Amino acid sequence: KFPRVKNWELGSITYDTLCAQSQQDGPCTPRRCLGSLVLPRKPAEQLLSQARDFINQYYSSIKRSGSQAHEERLQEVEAEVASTGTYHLRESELVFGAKQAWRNAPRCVGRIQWGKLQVFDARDCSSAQEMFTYICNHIKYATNRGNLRSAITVFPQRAPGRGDFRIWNSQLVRYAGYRQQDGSVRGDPANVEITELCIQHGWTPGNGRFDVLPLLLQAPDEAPELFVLPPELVLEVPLEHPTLEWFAALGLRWYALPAVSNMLLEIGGLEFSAAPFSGWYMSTEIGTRNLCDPHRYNILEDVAVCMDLDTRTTSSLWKDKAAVEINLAVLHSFQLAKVTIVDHHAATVSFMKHLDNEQKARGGCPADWAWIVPPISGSLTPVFHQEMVNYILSPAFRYQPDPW
Amino acid sequence: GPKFPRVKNWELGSITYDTLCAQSQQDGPCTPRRCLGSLVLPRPAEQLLSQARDFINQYYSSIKRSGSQAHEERLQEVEAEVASTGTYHLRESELVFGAKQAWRNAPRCVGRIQWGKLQVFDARDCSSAQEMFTYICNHIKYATNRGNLRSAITVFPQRAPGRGDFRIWNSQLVRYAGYRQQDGSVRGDPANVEITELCIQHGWTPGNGRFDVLPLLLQAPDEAPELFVLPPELVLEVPLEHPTLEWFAALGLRWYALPAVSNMLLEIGGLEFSAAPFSGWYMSTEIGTRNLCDPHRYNILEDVAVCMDLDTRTTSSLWKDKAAVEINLAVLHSFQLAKVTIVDHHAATVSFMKHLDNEQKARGGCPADWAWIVPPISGSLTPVFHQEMVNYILSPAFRYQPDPW
Ligand code: HEM
Ligand code: HEM
Ligand SMILES: CNCCN(C)c1cncc(CCc2cc(C)cc(N)n2)c1
Ligand SMILES: CNCCN(C)c1cncc(CCc2cc(C)cc(N)n2)c1
Ligand SMILES: C[C@H](O)[C@H](O)[C@H]1CNc2nc(N)[nH]c(=O)c2N1
Ligand SMILES: C[C@H](O)[C@H](O)[C@H]1CNc2nc(N)[nH]c(=O)c2N1
Ligand SMILES: [Zn+2]
């Protein structure tokens, strides 16, 4: 049985058949749905089968499926697993695998872009120092003077005999969070733990709200090392508002490059524990979540007071009013600085086009509705009205435990 | 540790475990292979007895008499009744318990903090379509209460073997007509096109406004549905104005005070009440965001944004978000002015979090549909956005049922 998927705005119905290609179970059972949970509660034969399936995927994608190059390649993989317990990917295969991982990421609204991804092979990396070099080039390439380009750098895969290559930071750019004795937090509350780990490993702390953290980089079975990014590498956008002169006074800012550095990339059963990837922001990530979440910078009441709003009652919708001006500020400021950004309406409309492309290409598209629908103005966007099917395809980005 | 779903709040960092889901007997649409949680509508003899036995156990527990002699005698009384007739009857207070528990169990309802405060009108004696009309008018009168809205449900006779159903054809007691135009467009509410055409086929003389109140199509057992027009003074409405945008009132928008769902099935202990309309009060985003701004409903966003003189030629001006906010404010302001009960999406979600905490202590969980609980605007500004939820089906329940035609 294949899920029947309906759009409630248009009346149109599709059938997801791609989900039958899922080999990995999610958190739901027929007794109870667990789709709103953020994290999971969580053999040569099995590695070999994921390898076969992936190699078949690759040769099918270049329409050389069944051919001699294909046959001989499966033989290589099988021969290599049989005597070493593992294998290695060709650069071309890794490029394919990385693009598919993005394509398959059900929580990502930006997947219209999935075929345009620059892949840096960093598998010849043997130290934190080289990782840092690779990371710096990635940032320079990706940022491209505000003309953002999507990229991934892939460090050496996990191996049975040793500890992982890891980037301890959750993103390549993070603002420090400084825990106060008086309970509160200066800077980004989301980054208290990593800030403290940086200090413990000997970083000289700042005292600002927007102090860019150093990277903690780890080569196998070694203590992590500390590397400060050259400030000229981290593009930042001061936030002002198009018609509210006082907004700029607030001294708000955000960095240009969203670069996730703590997820695991799995391809054909191989696991890449350090494989930082980046694109460009959707404005609501900065304007709504990072700046307005109560457990983040939490600036809503501040902005509302400057707007002289009735802060004393919920029914004046001050929160809603302030959040809209904040999101507008982010868009205006990024556009003024010529740094790539996408608003949530433009993003969700392109995501609808992606669904349509994928329906035609693959018979469906794994999508996590709760993460696709923006944090403000949900039903004002087309994705709100679109039913979606969530499931796990490989290659995939996965979460993994923090390495401390 | 515990072998039940771990549930996390990401704002507060706090953890619970849902043990109540263990009580679920009916399977939802998901499997380990794929999550179908965002689908609005996914695809008796011994059976009856087990559902019946379970409900009576629920009832006696609610009154703290499990295992008692009255408990076992009621169980005996029920199976005796099923053995000789195939069905059975609820005592009055069982029906009252069941109706409240059905609301309490409703995963898509954010208003469940009020669940214990429900007026239950017993209408299981009703025997004509004219009589259904009297019960409905009475319900509307009681529930509207001149703007001081009171939750209520009226329960009509249960499905009976052989005999036909009591059905209310309309999806709500109050519904604006949707008139399909020559040019293909719709005047009024596009959601109500079919029911409008059904009323007409059954002899209603149609109007031509954006806000014409539909007559009721009420159906008694094995009879064609009869048509009934509500006395306009029984249908309380609120004209919409804005607290500072003076032109907003000139738009001629309005909404009715009483949201009363009339097409759902109430199931208790295997017994099915095919007509059992229930009503509460509105959360403002239902009117202001969904009914007025959905592209496939009234679709007024562009009208308002033009009046607000916003740049509607580019998404990045956030004209849609700006207009939606003011439309929601107008709804809240106009209901407040008219002294008609309403709740904003902030107050409502805050009260739902309190409800989740009450239920965690009372029952060890609360079935909840995250996509439906989180409001259609300002999602992450409300605390439920940061709350993981477990969705599952408990009974008593309100269920969807096929349209009777
Ligand atoms: C090009 C512009 C892109 C945009 C606008 C975009 C947008 C987004 C957004 C809004 C989210 C939700 C994030 C959150 O709320 O925490 C997300 C998640 C995600 N994105 Fe994209 N993305 C882009 C590029 C990429 C690229 C290049 C990759 C990988 C190569 C990627 C992979 C992912 C993954 C794996 C997630 C899920 C993260 C998680 O589960 O925490 N995205 N994206
Ligand atoms: C007292 C104030 C109440 C409020 C603010 C409230 C709020 C809501 C809201 C906002 C929804 C979402 C509906 C949609 O978006 O289509 C909903 C659904 C629902 N409500 Fe409540 N409600 C209230 C009272 C009641 C009562 C008295 C009952 C029954 C006794 C009830 C039962 C339900 C059920 C069964 C649904 C699911 C409807 C569906 O799945 O289509 N509610 N409610
Ligand atoms: C669920 N735990 C981790 C959350 N996480 C990895 C995360 C948190 N906050 C923000 C992001 C940014 C995600 C992202 C990635 C890319 C490539 C582009 C973009 N605009 N956003 C990710
Ligand atoms: C999704 N299928 C059913 C449609 N449906 C029942 C529905 C649609 N649109 C709006 C409502 C209103 C739901 C409701 C019910 C009650 C008692 C109170 C309230 N505030 N809202 C219901
Ligand atoms: C509990 C809930 O699932 C959680 O708050 C989710 C909701 N949807 C989200 N959507 C996005 N894009 N990012 C998020 O962090 C979240 N958080
Ligand atoms: C596809 C999606 O499930 C559908 O549009 C849902 C989303 N959440 C909703 N939430 C509520 N309260 N009411 C709705 O009608 C919907 N529609
Ligand atoms: Zn699910």
Side-chain angles (χ1 to χ4, degrees), chain A residues 36-38 107 289 370-373, chain B residues 8 10 370 385-388:
Chain A
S36 78
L37 306 217
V38 175
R107 287 176 178 183
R289 308 297 316 286
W371 282 61
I372 298 296
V373 173
Chain B
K8 183 173 206 258
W10 285 85
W370 191 96
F385 180 102
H386 313 276
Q387 177 66 54
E388 299 175 343

Side-chain angles (χ1 to χ4, degrees), chain A residues 202-275:
Chain A
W203 177 55
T204 293
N207 62 320
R209 295 193 77 183
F210 293 104
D211 297 325
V212 179
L213 286 175
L215 300 173
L216 271 175
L217 306 182
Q218 186 183 39
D221 307 308
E222 292 292 344
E225 295 179 36
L226 203 60
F227 302 90
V228 175
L229 300 156
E232 60 277 23
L233 264 176
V234 177
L235 183 49
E236 293 185 82
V237 177
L239 299 200
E240 62 179 51
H241 189 278
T243 50
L244 305 170
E245 357 72 55
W246 51 258
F247 196 98
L250 296 173
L252 267 15
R253 64 203 296 149
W254 205 260
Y255 53 91
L257 190 70
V260 171
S261 58
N262 72 163
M263 291 186 77
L264 183 150
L265 159 64
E266 179 266 327
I267 308 178
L270 293 183
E271 301 181 331
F272 297 88
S273 63

Side-chain angles (χ1 to χ4, degrees), chain B residues 26-234:
Chain B
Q26 197 173 34
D27 306 324
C30 301
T31 70
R33 244 203 196 82
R34 82 296 190 267
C35 174
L36 255 43
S38 71
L39 300 223
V40 172
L41 311 167
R43 281 71 53 217
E46 171 240 308
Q47 172 94 298
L48 215 207
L49 228 51
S50 64
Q51 283 169 273
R53 285 194 208 92
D54 180 86
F55 171 72
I56 297 303
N57 296 343
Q58 286 192 50
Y59 177 71
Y60 278 86
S61 292
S62 85
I63 67 177
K64 317 299 179 39
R65 305 301 162 203
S66 291
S68 70
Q69 175 170 301
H71 183 184
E72 304 291 325
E73 283 170 6
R74 184 68 178 115
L75 287 157
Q76 284 184 155
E77 185 163 73
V78 169
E79 47 210 24
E81 247 207 287
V82 167
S84 59
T85 74
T87 197
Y88 73 110
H89 298 235
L90 296 174
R91 297 192 190 163
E92 163 199 65
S93 68
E94 303 177 340
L95 178 64
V96 172
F97 165 78
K100 293 181 182 175
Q101 200 82 347
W103 180 13
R104 187 194 197 174
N105 288 343
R108 298 186 161 168
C109 179
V110 69
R112 283 175 285 164
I113 191 69
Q114 297 284 147
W115 78 266
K117 189 174 176 187
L118 179 61
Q119 178 61 34
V120 175
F121 295 108
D122 198 336
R124 297 178 286 161
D125 67 339
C126 180
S127 57
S128 81
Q130 169 60 67
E131 199 173 355
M132 293 178 68
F133 184 61
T134 304
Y135 272 113
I136 288 164
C137 285
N138 281 351
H139 176 124
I140 290 174
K141 291 204 271 271
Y142 177 93
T144 304
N145 189 23
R146 305 230 312 289
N148 190 19
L149 275 37
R150 293 180 289 213
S151 296
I153 186 181
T154 297
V155 178
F156 291 108
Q158 61 199 55
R159 274 216 184 88
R163 188 258 280 157
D165 288 348
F166 283 86
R167 291 299 309 263
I168 305 167
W169 287 32
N170 318 44
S171 73
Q172 301 185 26
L173 298 186
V174 190
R175 294 273 72 193
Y176 298 122
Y179 306 119
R180 169 153 304 283
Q181 303 297 278
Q182 275 159 291
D183 36 85
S185 63
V186 175
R187 185 180 299 165
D189 194 337
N192 302 322
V193 161
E194 191 174 4
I195 191 67
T196 302
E197 297 177 349
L198 280 185
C199 293
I200 295 174
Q201 291 180 19
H202 289 87
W204 180 58
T205 286
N208 59 11
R210 294 189 86 185
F211 299 107
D212 299 335
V213 175
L214 283 168
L216 260 22
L217 235 355
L218 307 176
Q219 165 178 70
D222 306 286
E223 293 202 280
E226 289 182 67
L227 203 52
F228 292 96
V229 184
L230 300 160
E233 46 282 349
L234 255 45

Side-chain angles (χ1 to χ4, degrees), chain A residues 168-170 174-179 185 188-201 203 213 216 262 401-404:
Chain A
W168 284 30
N169 310 50
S170 67
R174 299 267 68 197
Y175 294 129
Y178 301 123
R179 186 129 66 199
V185 172
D188 196 337
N191 301 316
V192 168
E193 187 172 35
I194 185 67
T195 293
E196 294 178 353
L197 283 163
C198 288
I199 292 169
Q200 160 181 161
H201 289 86
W203 177 55
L213 286 175
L216 271 175
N262 72 163
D402 296 316
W404 59 91

Side-chain angles (χ1 to χ4, degrees), chain A residues 44-183:
Chain A
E45 87 299 334
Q46 191 185 126
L47 172 60
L48 198 53
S49 72
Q50 309 173 239
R52 293 202 212 272
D53 168 88
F54 167 75
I55 291 298
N56 292 320
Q57 282 190 58
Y58 173 77
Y59 278 89
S60 168
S61 82
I62 65 169
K63 23 273 180 189
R64 289 301 178 265
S65 200
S67 62
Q68 284 283 16
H70 187 182
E71 284 175 30
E72 292 172 355
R73 177 59 179 141
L74 297 156
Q75 296 175 351
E76 286 190 1
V77 165
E78 179 153 336
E80 194 171 346
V81 173
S83 43
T84 73
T86 189
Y87 72 105
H88 295 76
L89 299 170
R90 301 272 219 269
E91 187 174 354
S92 60
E93 291 162 357
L94 172 82
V95 176
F96 174 75
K99 292 171 172 166
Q100 292 300 122
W102 184 10
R103 185 184 191 180
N104 294 328
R107 287 176 178 183
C108 175
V109 74
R111 291 180 275 168
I112 191 70
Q113 284 299 142
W114 77 266
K116 190 157 247 173
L117 181 67
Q118 175 61 46
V119 174
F120 304 106
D121 193 345
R123 290 171 299 169
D124 63 334
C125 193
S126 65
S127 68
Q129 260 294 341
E130 297 180 64
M131 292 179 64
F132 184 56
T133 290
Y134 277 104
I135 282 165
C136 283
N137 294 335
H138 174 133
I139 290 180
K140 176 265 179 182
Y141 176 85
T143 308
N144 182 222
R145 304 175 51 194
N147 217 149
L148 274 36
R149 309 183 271 189
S150 314
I152 186 174
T153 296
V154 182
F155 290 107
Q157 66 205 54
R158 311 229 289 135
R162 56 117 167 110
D164 301 337
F165 282 83
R166 290 295 304 257
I167 297 163
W168 284 30
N169 310 50
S170 67
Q171 291 188 38
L172 303 185
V173 187
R174 299 267 68 197
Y175 294 129
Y178 301 123
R179 186 129 66 199
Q180 312 295 273
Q181 55 171 34
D182 33 302

Side-chain angles (χ1 to χ4, degrees), chain A residues 4 9 22 25-26 28 30-33 36 38 41 288 314-315 320 343-345 375 377-379 387-388 390-391, chain B residues 2 17 24 27-28 30 32-35 38 40 43 289 295 315 321 344-346 376 378-380 388-389 391-392:
Chain A
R4 162 186 163 182
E9 171 190 343
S22 186
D25 294 337
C28 309
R31 148 161 290 163
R32 79 287 177 283
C33 167
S36 78
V38 175
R41 251 288 205 157
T288 303
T314 58
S315 45
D320 314 76
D343 69 74
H344 55 294
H345 302 281
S377 300
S379 72
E387 290 176 0
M388 307 183 187
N390 195 10
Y391 47 97
Chain B
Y17 294 84
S24 182
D27 306 324
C30 301
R33 244 203 196 82
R34 82 296 190 267
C35 174
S38 71
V40 172
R43 281 71 53 217
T289 306
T315 53
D321 314 71
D344 67 74
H345 51 293
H346 304 283
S378 308
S380 74
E388 299 175 343
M389 293 171 203
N391 192 193
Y392 47 93

